[PDB]
Amino acid sequence: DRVKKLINSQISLLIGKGLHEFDSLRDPEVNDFRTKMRQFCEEAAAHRQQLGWVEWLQYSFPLQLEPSARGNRALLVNVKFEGSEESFTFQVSTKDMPLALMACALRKKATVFRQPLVEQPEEYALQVNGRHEYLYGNYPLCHFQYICSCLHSGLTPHLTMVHSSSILAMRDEQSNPASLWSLEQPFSIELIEGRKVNADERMKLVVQAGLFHGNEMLCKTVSSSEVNVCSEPVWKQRLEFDISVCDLPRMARLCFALYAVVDCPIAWANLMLFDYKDQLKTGERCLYMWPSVLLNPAGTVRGNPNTESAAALVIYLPEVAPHPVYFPALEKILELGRHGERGRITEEEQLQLREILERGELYEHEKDLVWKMRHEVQEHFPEALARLLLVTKWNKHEDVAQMLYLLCSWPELPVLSALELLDFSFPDCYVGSFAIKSLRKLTDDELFQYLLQLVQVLKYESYLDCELTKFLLGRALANRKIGHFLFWHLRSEMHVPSVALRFGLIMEAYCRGSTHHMKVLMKQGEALSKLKALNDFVKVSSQKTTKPQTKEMMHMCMRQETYMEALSHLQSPLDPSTLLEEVCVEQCTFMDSKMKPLWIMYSSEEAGSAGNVGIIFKNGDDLRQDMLTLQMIQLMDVLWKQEGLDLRMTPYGCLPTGDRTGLIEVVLHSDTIANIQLNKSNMAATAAFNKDALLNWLKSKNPGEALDRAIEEFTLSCAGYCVATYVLGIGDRHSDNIMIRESGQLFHIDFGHFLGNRERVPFILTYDFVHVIQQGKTNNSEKFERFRGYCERAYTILRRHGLLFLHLFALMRAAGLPELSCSKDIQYLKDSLALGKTEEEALKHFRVKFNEALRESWKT
Ligand SMILES: Oc1cccc(-c2cccc([C@]34CCOC[C@H]3C4)n2)c1
Numbered sequence: 001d002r003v004k005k006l007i008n009s010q011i012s013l014l015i016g017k018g019l020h021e022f023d024s025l026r027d028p029e030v031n032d033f034r035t036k037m038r039q040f041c042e043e044a045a046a047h048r049q050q051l052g053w054v055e056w057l058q059y060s061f062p063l064q065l066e067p068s069a070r071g072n073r074a075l076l077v078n079v080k081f082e083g084s085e086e087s088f089t090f091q092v093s094t095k096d097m098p099l100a101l102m103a104c105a106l107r108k109k110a111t112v113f114r115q116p117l118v119e120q121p122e123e124y125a126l127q128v129n130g131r132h133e134y135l136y137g138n139y140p141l142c143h144f145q146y147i148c149s150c151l152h153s154g155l156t157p158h159l160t161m162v163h164s165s166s167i168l169a170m171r172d173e174q175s176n177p178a179s180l181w182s183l184e185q186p187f188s189i190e191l192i193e194g195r196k197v198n199a200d201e202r203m204k205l206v207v208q209a210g211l212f213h214g215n216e217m218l219c220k221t222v223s224s225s226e227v228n229v230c231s232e233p234v235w236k237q238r239l240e241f242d243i244s245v246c247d248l249p250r251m252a253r254l255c256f257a258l259y260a261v262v263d264c265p266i267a268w269a270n271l272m273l274f275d276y277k278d279q280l281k282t283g284e285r286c287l288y289m290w291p292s293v294l295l296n297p298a299g300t301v302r303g304n305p306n307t308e309s310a311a312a313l314v315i316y317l318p319e320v321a322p323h324p325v326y327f328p329a330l331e332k333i334l335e336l337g338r339h340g341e342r343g344r345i346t347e348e349e350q351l352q353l354r355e356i357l358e359r360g361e362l363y364e365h366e367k368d369l370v371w372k373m374r375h376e377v378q379e380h381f382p383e384a385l386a387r388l389l390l391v392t393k394w395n396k397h398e399d400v401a402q403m404l405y406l407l408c409s410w411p412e413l414p415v416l417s418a419l420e421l422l423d424f425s426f427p428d429c430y431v432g433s434f435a436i437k438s439l440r441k442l443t444d445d446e447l448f449q450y451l452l453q454l455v456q457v458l459k460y461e462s463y464l465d466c467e468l469t470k471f472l473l474g475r476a477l478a479n480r481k482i483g484h485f486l487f488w489h490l491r492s493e494m495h496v497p498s499v500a501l502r503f504g505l506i507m508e509a510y511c512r513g514s515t516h517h518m519k520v521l522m523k524q525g526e527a528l529s530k531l532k533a534l535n536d537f538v539k540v541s542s543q544k545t546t547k548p549q550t551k552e553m554m555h556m557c558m559r560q561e562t563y564m565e566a567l568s569h570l571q572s573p574l575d576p577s578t579l580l581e582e583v584c585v586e587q588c589t590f591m592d593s594k595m596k597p598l599w600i601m602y603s604s605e606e607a608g609s610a611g612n613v614g615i616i617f618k619n620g621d622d623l624r625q626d627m628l629t630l631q632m633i634q635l636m637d638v639l640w641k642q643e644g645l646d647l648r649m650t651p652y653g654c655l656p657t658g659d660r661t662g663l664i665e666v667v668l669h670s671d672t673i674a675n676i677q678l679n680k681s682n683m684a685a686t687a688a689f690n691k692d693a694l695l696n697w698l699k700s701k702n703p704g705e706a707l708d709r710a711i712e713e714f715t716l717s718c719a720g721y722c723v724a725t726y727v728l729g730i731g732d733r734h735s736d737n738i739m740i741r742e743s744g745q746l747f748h749i750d751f752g753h754f755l756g757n758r759e760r761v762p763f764i765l766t767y768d769f770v771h772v773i774q775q776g777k778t779n780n781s782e783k784f785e786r787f788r789g790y791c792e793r794a795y796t797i798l799r800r801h802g803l804l805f806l807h808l809f810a811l812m813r814a815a816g817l818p819e820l821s822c823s824k825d826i827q828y829l830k831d832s833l834a835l836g837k838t839e840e841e842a843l844k845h846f847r848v849k850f851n852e853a854l855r856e857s858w859k860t
Contacts, residue, residue: 130607
């Protein structure tokens with residue numbers, strides 16, 4: 001129909017790639033992915049359109065609960081009914097549930113409307129005014145993030161009673177429209193020739209080839225003969241490997257590196273030896289190579305799409321049999337693996353085995369004992385699966401069969417264990433499928449917390465149709481907030497050729513599953529397009545005229561009908577719960593830094609004061625490492641809160657949306673330490689001593705009794721950020737990248753560098769901040785040591801979750817961030833968390849680094 005053609009054009013525009021481009025590849029793997037995932041996502045959409053009204057609230061407006069709630073005090077609340085300007089202000093308890101609040105609003109409505117009411121509180125949900133956020137379910141009001149925030153800020157919760165018929169009307173409005181093992185011969189290939197090779201004519205060309213299973217070599221690497229540098233080198237030679245065809249594991253990858261020698265790296269290319277349908281590849285392959293910025297096994301197994309300029313390697317995969325050869329089916333593997341010798345060992349060896357499995361590099365004899373005792377591992381140490389997988393001989397099909405027999409009856413593992421198993425160190429497809437099965441129990445909150453890392457893991461996948469893609473799509477189609485961030489994490493990397501195909505296909509499938517959300521996301525893309533054009537203008541103008549001039553010109557551009565329409569009434573890409581209603585042009589500006597980022601302000605009558613929100617649009621900087629740093633800080637805040645420690649952190653939004661483009665959430669009523677320390681005259685904060693400036697500023701924002709709370713907020717957040725910057729090795733910290741809220745809360749901005757990047761970043765204590773902590777007194781050991789206590793408690797909590805941080809950072813290596821590209825970068829985190837030590841030893845070490853920081857602070 002004409003509606004299908006329109007939806008196809010809308011998807012093409014949204015994802016940034018024409019769908020016709022998928023068809024043009026004439027790739028059966030692409031075609032099957034598109035068909036199967038379209039069916040899967042359309043089935044999820046059919047299920048969603050018939051959800052009950054409360055299930056539909058769970059889909060569109062998933063609950064935002066405090067970390068303590070997951071798994072007393074008087075409170076004033078303002079409640080109105082939908083489409084009525086009239087509101088009721090009443091007193092409830094923080095311990096009361098939404099149902100009691102709703103029953104109270106209904107009794108009030110019945111008295112005011114003089115009618116014995118027809119409505120039960122069970123037919124309603126409470127919307128947060130002017131936000132895509134609702135309060136519902138059997139949780140006390142203090143457990144909702146919105147109420148918890150209102151309590152901390154002192155503000156009165158403003159809620160709207162929304163009836164079930166109104167929620168159903170939303171559901172309806174948003175509907176989609178109407179045998180290998182016999183082949184003993186060594187594996188070999190013919191290296192035919194190269195095309196479009198660029199190198200120094202004085203040198204020679206060589207092709208290094210290796211067979212890998214993840215990062216691990218399946219045998220020794222082999223090199224071609226050296227042939228003189230030219231545009232079309234010709235080898236026409238056989239490269240034989242030290243591994244039988246029968247012993248190639250299912251996920252074996254053949255990896256190449258073309259280089260020049262008198263070493264000068266030129267290009268690299270990888271390919272899976274078996275296709276997506278489990279068939280062993282035969283015949284000619286033209287491999288369009290990727291430039292080398294020598295073998296790169298973690299590199300993509302798809303060819304470079306720039307076939308016009310890429311160097312190409314032509315190879316021949318020999319016909320090993322007169323008929324096609326497929327990897328054996330699971331039943332054949334299980335039959336082979338079912339047979340073995342069950343380990344019988346001494347009581348002393350059982351103690352030595354327990355010692356190593358509970359301990360991750362091992363010696364050869366330690367690996368032999370783990371393998372020998374693999375049945376004992378399964379039955380009594382199931383969480384040591386990763387250790388057993390690492391000792392398995394992936395180059396011996398009998399050993400692999402025996403490992404897979406145990407894997408297929410392995411008990412499900414905790415979420416923490418499964419995150420480790422997604423690492424590229426575990427490349428087998430059954431292992432990958434096992435990890436996904438153990439991750440199905442992830443709550444939507446945990447999935448959201450690790451979504452960024454799960455998206456990065458897609459870059460290690462060998463095939464398009466995989467369990468991780470299906471998992472992410474199914475969870476995204478069942479939770480609109482997950483769907484929102486899955487979309488943006490994929491869309492923001494469409495300018496990266498190695499992932500544009502895979503990411504483009506996932507975004508298309510998602511859109512098939514929610515036509516309405518596709519349109520919501522298109523409205524966000526239109527605002528982003530306008531912001532880029534506006535920012536390009538500001539960049540040009542800022543070099544030619546004065547700031548008030550560029551600001552008025554920026555304002556005139558925004559007041560154009562096309563800009564006013566595109567920039568208004570959208571869901572925020574930083575947070576789909578936040579609605580960006582009317583752009584407040586008068587309040588919009590830009591910042592003086594290099595990229596001239598735009599500062600965009602919004603207001604919303606319906607949301608009142610909560611509708612006053614800002615976004616910063618920045619183009620020219622890669623925001624991926626900032627987002628990762630902020631998400632790690634937010635995880636620290638969750639882990640602390642789960643132990644009842646609230647360090648008053650400010651986990652503001654940061655989201656890459658495109659090529660060196662993204663948004664940052666504005667924290668209103670905040671200023672940089674630098675601006676406050678300028679100590680300007682005729683201000684409430686003006687000081688006799690520069691050290692008095694920050695405290696005088698806090699006193700001016702918090703007069704009388706409020707000062708004590710502000711100093712406390714400052715102290716707790718200082719402790720949180722001191723521990724966060726030390727653990728993450730956040731460097732380049734000065735007064736212009738540290739901010740303070742009027743509440744007293746300190747937070748960090750502009751996370752350009754982390755993990756010591758290479759130098760070990762020491763713990764930092766600044767004397768201007770010690771002065772505030774000590775309430776302006778020269779000596780105040782009571783307050784200072786209380787602050788040290790918060791630091792120690794925060795640090796010991798993080799250490800206890802050390803493995804989670806390590807597993808997440810390990811998955812992030814797939815992102816290709818320059819400061820997270822090797823083992824040295826992660827060693828930084830291993831050292832800061834001192835995980836190879838006892839808690840008493842690590843606390844002793846932290847105390848040494850803290851005291852060293854105090855003595856450095858005392859020099860000021
Ligand atoms: O994470 C980054 C990365 C790069 C630049 C920055 C930045 C620079 C200047 C201002 C800000 C604020 C101002 C107050 O609200 C909080 C954040 C948005 N952030 C933050």
